[PDB]
Design a protein around this ligand. Structure first.
Ligand code: PC1
Lengths: 50, 101, 459, 70, 177, 87
């Protein structure tokens, strides 16, 4: 590509978003366990949130 | 006697002399024009118009609307059954223990 | 907060692998894109703050400062690309890398959930600022300005760290989310007295406080335009943010402790406004106005009422934008007349009409004309300090008059009257300068429509 | 009628800046307001209803405007 | 004792200025023309009575007592001409007195709206830049040792040359731009 | 508003005001006639002439310029230079 310097910041932003989504799964020790939002699982659903 | 052999102080440069259509970004006219276009596109057409549109349509900031609507329910509860609008105690007096005095 | 740190760090391969003269265009474009993506931090809830991970979290207080910083970086690059046109390419890349690094440390300071991490970034902002001031300044006194700026701040911040470490040995943790639930009342004793002094004097120094403000007129008027912007609009708010975070642990000893600093700021606003009434330098006038406004923010934080906190954060954002605009105006005049004297270039309305309009608008927002957010913040601080005591309004009200006595004066001597006869290098206003002032002012005028996003974490 | 020349500073640059500012604002101002009007007229606003039994709404289903929901 | 050409005010100029100020204040005191004419003739008699006084110190003491008399009975708000300093219309049009060198910064697109005027301006600039060295050499060869004594400028004593330092006085903006 | 003044008009006005003076007989004065020698006036009469022209033309002549004006052509030239006539 003749404009390869213009895809450094957007790729970095996509990488940061992906790392945020990856880090959110490691902090799921209380997913569907809170006293305010606990709920029986709906059909065709295995987690409350990703 | 000539202390400190030094280049003379250069005169000021006028960007309008060599290019009367200079926007003030660069002395090269094409680079100056492209910098002007980039600044005016990503400074007004992207981060101001779309930014103000995003800020204007924020989805219920700090639930400031919701706390009204729930209150619109809650009064309609306690006015219907003769209850007072607000109690003087935030917590129930039956479930709180005081030290002896 | 990893989605904002990574593009900011990737800005350095952008500015080092760019072309011979395409560094400014690429850096401005990608920093404006980062500023556009910065608006995703407005996911605020009425009870819960936005917590990202074990290290980074964003309340409704840090979010306007983050947005202001990431908005200020492209404006900074636009402002500092005229006096560096004669610079070396390597030195230009070094300057851009310094600005990028400073912005990275600033956006990592505000989101720190740990007070030690916050303190580390809060001192890490010192090195690029000092390097910029001492290297890319114009006068000799910048070297002196490199000392008073430095050894003041550390003299406030080196005891404070010890106090912070003491909390690590007392409460078991320094996480702000934990400390909101494990806080304890502070009894009246000499130990808690000196711990309060250690935890506060760094933020009084970096705000600044009257008496300790001596570094600010020196580090504002020798610094270049980018340094003046970074001191005026962001780096004076680190003290306010640190105060708002650290006042939680220092209760209820603050009620009788805040008296001498409140009196110092309430007299220092009058003293600095009177100094502004007789200053011969534009840059020193803007610096002393910044001192007065930050003394007002100090009073607002110290009386610690919800209206005071709201007025404090609104005043912080509004003063940052207004001081940045005033410093860019002073930089444009300095670049056109090659001097800093107020009385030198007079009657510029007959030569620059649009710059006269920008000067009038900036002076209008300086004296807090309603319904701008300057008036919102100053008004709410006035209401809170009238609730605190019924006499302080006098010490407010007189100050207001003196504000309207210098800002318009700063207009008149620079805009009205007969033009000087021996100055004939007054060029017309460039498109870059007008773009800079419009980008400074239009968010400030637009924020009056929806001010609820800059009203603190207890709105 | 003996017209005399009026000396004034060059207003070409300020007029050029104002014209460019107006153009670059309106260039995305007009499509945004057109799309907002077309959304408000055709898609419209939501309606307030009670939550039915056995069903839980999505996290974006508590907001009125389509732009806020999106 | 502040004059552009001289270093002091002589006795005659002091008497004339006192007479002019006294007559102006007398005109301000009485509104009507006939009363002013009567009292101006009276003041002219009072000044003409002591005209031929050869005693110099007696003239000085008469000047001092006349100045004290004028200061005792002058109008609190004397009449000021509108263009005179302290008037209502004084320095009003200085906001429209644009200097000429701004025309050097005009764009070529708006410079084409007045072709002949800018041609004459170019001719004027050529004349100034070709006469500048001649007039500065005229100035440097006429000023005595130790700088000039007064602020009076010499005229053009040759044929074809212009008086020195003529540009900013000839090309000043008009009183009604 | 403010009709333009020409050199002929200024010379006519100054000759009118000088002709309406009883100390100057109208059959002898000319436009290049000196006040002190050609007409035999006085310094007080010169001050009266200067303030008469000041009241006639509606603008004030400073004293440093009034003391050097002694002939109607000089007054015409001074008023012409001040009012920027013949444009
Ligand atoms: C925040 C900290 C950092 C600060 C710097 C930020 C830099 C980046 C800036 C990004 C873009 C800007 C963001 C903020 C946007 C603020 C504006 C906004 O969206 O407001 C939301 C508000 C939202 O209004 P609302 O909240 O009342 O409406 C409810 C919400 N919606 C819209 C979903 C229904 O927008 C408005 O109020 C717009 C109203 C219509 C447009 C204006 C009409 C009147 C115009 C003036 C008429 C003439 C008056 C008299 C004039 C006389 C002469 C002077």
């Amino acid at each position: 590509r003749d404009h390869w310097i213009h895809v450094l910041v957007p790729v970095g932003f996509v990488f940061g978003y992906y790392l945020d989504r990856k880090n959110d799964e490691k902090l799921a020790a209380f997913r569907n366990k809170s006293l305010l939002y606990k709920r029986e699982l709906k059909p065709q659903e295995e987690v409350t949130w990703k | 006697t000539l202390r400190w052999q030094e280049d003379p102080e250069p005169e000021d440069e006028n960007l309008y002399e060599k290019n009367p259509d200079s926007h003030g970004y660069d002395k090269d006219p094409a680079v100056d024009v492209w910098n002007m276009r980039v600044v005016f596109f990503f400074g007004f057409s992207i981060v101001l118009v779309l930014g103000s549109t995003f800020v204007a349509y924020l989805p219920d900031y700090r639930m400031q609307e919701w706390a009204r609507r729930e209150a619109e329910r809650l009064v309609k509860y306690r006015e219907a059954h003769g209850l007072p609008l607000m109690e003087s105690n935030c917590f129930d007096p039956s479930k709180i223990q005081l030290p002896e005095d | 907060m990893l989605k904002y740190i990574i593009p900011t760090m990737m800005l350095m391969p952008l500015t080092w692998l760019s072309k011979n003269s395409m560094i400014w265009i690429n850096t401005t474009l990608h920093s404006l894109l980062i500023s556009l993506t910065s608006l995703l931090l407005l996911n605020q809830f009425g009870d819960n703050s936005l917590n990202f991970s074990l290290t980074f979290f964003s309340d409704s207080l840090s979010t306007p400062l983050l947005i202001l910083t990431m908005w200020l970086l492209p404006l900074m690059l636009m402002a500092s690309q005229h006096h560096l046109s004669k610079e070396n390419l390597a030195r230009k890349k070094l300057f851009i890398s310094m600005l990028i690094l400073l912005q990275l440390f600033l956006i990592m300071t505000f989101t720190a959930t740990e007070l030690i991490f916050f303190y580390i970034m809060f001192e890490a902002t010192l090195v690029p600022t000092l390097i910029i001031i001492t290297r890319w300044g114009n006068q000799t006194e910048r070297l002196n300005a490199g000392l008073y700026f430095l050894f003041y701040t550390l003299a406030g911040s080196l005891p404070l760290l010890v106090a912070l470490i003491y909390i690590q040995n007392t409460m078991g943790s320094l996480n702000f989310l934990i400390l909101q639930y494990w806080v304890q009342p502070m009894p009246n004793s000499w130990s808690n007295t000196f711990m309060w002094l250690a935890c506060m004097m760094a933020f009084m120094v970096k705000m600044p406080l009257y008496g300790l403000h001596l570094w600010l007129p020196k580090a504002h008027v020798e610094a270049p335009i980018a340094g003046s912007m970074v001191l005026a609009a962001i780096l004076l708010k680190l003290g306010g943010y640190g105060m708002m975070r650290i006042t939680l642990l220092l209760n209820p000893i603050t009620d009788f402790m805040a008296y001498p600093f409140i009196m110092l700021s309430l007299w220092g606003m009058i003293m600095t406004s009177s100094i502004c009434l007789r200053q011969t330098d534009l840059k020193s006038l803007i610096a002393y106005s910044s001192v007065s406004h930050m003394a007002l923010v100090i009073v607002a934080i110290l009386i610690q009422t919800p209206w005071s906190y709201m007025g404090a954060t609104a005043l912080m954002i509004a003063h940052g934008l207004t001081s940045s605009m005033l410093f860019c105006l002073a930089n444009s005049n300095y670049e056109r007349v090659h001097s800093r004297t107020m009385i030198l270039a007079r009657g510029l309305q007959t030569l620059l009409p649009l710059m006269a309009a920008w000067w009038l608008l900036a002076s209008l927002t300086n004296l807090a004309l309603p319904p701008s957010i300057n008036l919102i913040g100053e008004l709410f601080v006035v209401m809170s300090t009238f609730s605190w005591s019924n006499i302080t309004i006098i010490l407010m009200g007189l100050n207001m008059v003196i504000t309207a006595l210098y800002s318009l004066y700063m207009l008149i001597t620079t805009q009205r009257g007969k033009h000087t006869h021996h100055i004939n290098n007054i060029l017309p206003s460039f498109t870059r300068e007008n773009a800079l002032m419009s980008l400074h002012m239009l968010p400030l005028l637009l924020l009056s429509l929806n001010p609820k996003i800059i009203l603190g974490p207890l709105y | 009628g003996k017209r005399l020349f009026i000396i004034k500073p060059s207003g070409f640059y300020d007029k050029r800046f104002l014209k460019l500012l107006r153009f670059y604002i309106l260039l995305t101002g007009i499509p945004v307001v057109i799309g907002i009007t077309l959304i408000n007229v055709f898609i419209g606003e939501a309606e307030l209803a009670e939550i039915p039994e056995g069903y839980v709404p999505e996290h974006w289903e508590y907001f009125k405007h389509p732009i806020s929901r999106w | 004792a502040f004059l552009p050409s001289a270093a002091y005010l002589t006795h005659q100029q002091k008497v004339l200025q006192l007479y002019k100020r006294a007559l102006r204040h007398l005109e301000s005191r009485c509104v009507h023309r006939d009363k002013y004419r009567y009292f101006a003739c009276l003041l002219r008699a009072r000044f003409d009575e002591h005209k031929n006084e050869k005693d110099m110190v007696k003239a000085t003491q008469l000047l001092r007592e006349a100045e004290k008399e004028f200061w005792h009975g002058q109008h609190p708000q004397p009449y000021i001409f509108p263009e005179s300093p302290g008037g209502t219309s004084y320095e009003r049009y200085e906001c429209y007195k644009v200097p000429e060198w701004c025309l050097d910064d005009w764009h070529p697109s708006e410079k084409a709206m007045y072709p002949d005027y800018f041609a004459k301006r170019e001719q004027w600039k050529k004349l100034r830049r070709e006469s500048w060295e001649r007039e500065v050499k005229q100035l440097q060869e006429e000023t005595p040792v130790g700088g000039p004594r007064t602020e009076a400028l010499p005229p053009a004593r040759k044929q074809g040359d212009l008086p020195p330092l003529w540009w900013h006085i000839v090309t000043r903006p008009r009183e009604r731009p | 508003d403010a009709p333009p003044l020409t050199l002929e008009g200024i010379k006519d006005r100054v000759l009118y005001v000088l002709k309406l003076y009883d100390k100057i007989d109208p059959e002898k004065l000319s436009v290049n006639s000196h006040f002190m020698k050609d007409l035999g006036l006085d310094s007080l009469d010169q001050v009266e002439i200067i303030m008469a022209m000041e009241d006639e033309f509606g603008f004030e002549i400073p004293d440093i310029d009034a003391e050097k004006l002694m002939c109607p052509q000089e007054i015409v030239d001074y008023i012409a230079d001040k009012k920027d006539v013949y444009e």
